[PDB]
Design a protein around this ligand. Sequence first.
Ligand code: IJ6
Length: 658
Amino acid sequence: ISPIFQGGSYQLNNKSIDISSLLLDKLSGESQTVVMKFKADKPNSLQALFGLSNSKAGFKNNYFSIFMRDSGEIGVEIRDAQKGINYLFSRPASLWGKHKGQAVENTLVFVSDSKDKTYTMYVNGIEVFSETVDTFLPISNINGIDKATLGAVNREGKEHYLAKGSIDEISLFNKAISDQEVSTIPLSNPFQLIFQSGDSTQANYFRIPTLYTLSSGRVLSSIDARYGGTHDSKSKINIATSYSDDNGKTWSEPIFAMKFNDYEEQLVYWPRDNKLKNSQISGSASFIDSSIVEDKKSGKTILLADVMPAGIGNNNANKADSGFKEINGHYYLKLKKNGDNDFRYTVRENGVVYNETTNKPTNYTINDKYEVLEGGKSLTVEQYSVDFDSGSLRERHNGKQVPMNVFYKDSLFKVTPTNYIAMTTSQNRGESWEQFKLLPPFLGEKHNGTYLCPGQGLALKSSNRLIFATYTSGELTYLISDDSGQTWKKSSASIPFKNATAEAQMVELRDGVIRTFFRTTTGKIAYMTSRDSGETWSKVSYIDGIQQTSYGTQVSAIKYSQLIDGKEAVILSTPNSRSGRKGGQLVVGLVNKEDDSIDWKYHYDIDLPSYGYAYSAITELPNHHIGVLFEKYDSWSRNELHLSNVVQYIDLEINDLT
Ligand SMILES: O=S(=O)(O)CCNCC1CCCCC1
């Protein structure tokens, strides 16, 4: 259908533009669509892009607005004091501000559908909210509307919520356009999606991105596919992967690298209201925080992640138990059988379940998928599904049988309720993944596993050495393999912190010389150095010129292949803010060959200082461009939980950064 009104190139310079005579008499019927292409790289704190109001004295609360905040939040108000209606719908972190220093043209589509009684907002091709109401308020049925306004709302004759920005194009339709029609509207997106709601993972949420460039030229990404909102474990979370063979222009449909099936893969809209938002899937096993490296020698791609048994997360994990029993120099996985108070079993060689009290093998075995067999026959459990149909979160059996896994709630034999690290490998560069295997304890029988640092492992350039950083209380614990990941040893580097989330990423400054950058509790990013390929580590120092919050945020880092200003270069990706997870930057450091110190010379702004930026992944793409996959929202904020499609990918060139 043709638009009833269309205008363009409006500059919003803290002065409203009146379009009443062009639009108001054209509005008819109870359904409308607004399509608006707009820029705002220096927004006010709160500003209206579009308003329909009763501007008469005594009717200040009779209006419709489309508004934004300098946080990147988008929203609408629909109000009529006579009808007693005051709707306010919004979602944080919905907008772009700048990309490569130029203002981004955001494409906004707002559908007011009277038949459905639903208000739906899309920005940049992403649905950010869809709200169904009991009593529908058509945007043009507001009592006494007499002004149509761009860049403010006219209330009682005055300009409220003045906007700074521009509207390149605005169209209105006297119809609620269908989802199919919305999808045909052209976009000018500065970003891509690799993982997204509705894809093959069927997760509605995603966190903790990784990127790694393989020697073939293929670029690989992994991620937490989070089902029960954006919550850390305890929850349902799988590790998913996708790859690109064209320098990041397109990406394969995701597959899983690690997955559990005790709960259904459900695409669920997790509630965002204050009463329900902390609802958390509490009976599911999960994976969380993945990291990838490529092994030159074997050709294998190796991926590690934390594993959490049913109902377990960092919070309630059995500290003081590895989950393993050491028996004459070997670690065996412990099991507790239904009805016992203690863990009287171990998993011996060939998956044989052994009774530690009677010292006899049982007629139970654990296969390579950690599934329980009895007399060689596969046992099963019934799968759970989740719903909020009763007004609160419900977890219940759904009629479907799946293999009984020792990480599951319903399993006859259960592992120790603590955190583990698992490893999987791919021999076809991410096209498929082998069944995962648990790594052994590294810090003793009665110490819970260390926590994997998400992002990349490190493959040393002049040897076969592989290193994955992990952390625990009081130290970074580096896991080192010289045999393609078949065996691992630890290298402990104490840090002056108790219980910090010390997420660490490494760069090889030169042969044998490793610099590790890591998150702390001090508001500054820290670093340490190894000059012997990770055997021993320096004391801790801190980077100046970058701010983090007290709780900190994961940081990613690479050694760039090409010289910059004649020097070896490291690139760092992090929020640069003392206030929240926002103000995303790539910081380019030039290495001083004399002393290995780094001159942090260039700071590239990913988007606005006030716009969200949390966990991130960076890689040098085969064409020497930089790929960034990152959480474009404040993933700490309790106001920004459970947003869909905020993990986004962008392509940059080195000249963009300098
Ligand atoms: O809250 S954030 O800093 O965004 C994420 C922190 N996750 C913590 C970590 C999760 C997996 C293993 C236990 C600890």
